[PDB]
Design brief:
This is part of a larger assembly, with chains A (50 residues) and B (34 residues).
Chain A lengths: L1 H10 L17 H21 L1
Chain B lengths: L34
The chains are: A mainly alpha (50), B little secondary structure (34).
PDB class: membrane protein
Keywords: Multidrug resistance, efflux, complex
Entry title: Cryo-EM structure of multidrug efflux pump MexAB-OprM (60 degree state)
Chain lengths: 50, 34
């Protein structure tokens, strides 16, 4: 998904005037927050059992 | 021969058409080709 963002951000100095590229639907932050909360609760669990 | 969208006294880019797009400040020089 970062590579798709990088491809569009490397292509954007060549589009015609008046054309934006928008990202309406994107299940990247769902996966990112859903694994980040697991990493946070792993750290909280080991520190808390300590 | 043009009819609309281009009146008298205008300027037209005719050489050096690779680092240009509509919406950027570009300097001027008279054209090399006739």
């Amino acid at each position: 998904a970062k590579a798709i963002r990088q491809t569009i951000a490397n292509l954007e100095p060549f589009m015609p005037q008046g054309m934006k590229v928008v990202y309406p639907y994107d299940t990247t932050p769902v996966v990112s927050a859903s694994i980040h909360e697991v990493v946070k609760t792993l750290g909280e669990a080991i520190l808390l059992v300590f | 021969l043009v009819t609309e969208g281009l009146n008298a006294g205008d300027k037209i880019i005719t050489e050096g058409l690779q680092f240009v797009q509509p919406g950027v400040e570009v300097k001027t020089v008279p054209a090399k080709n006739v």
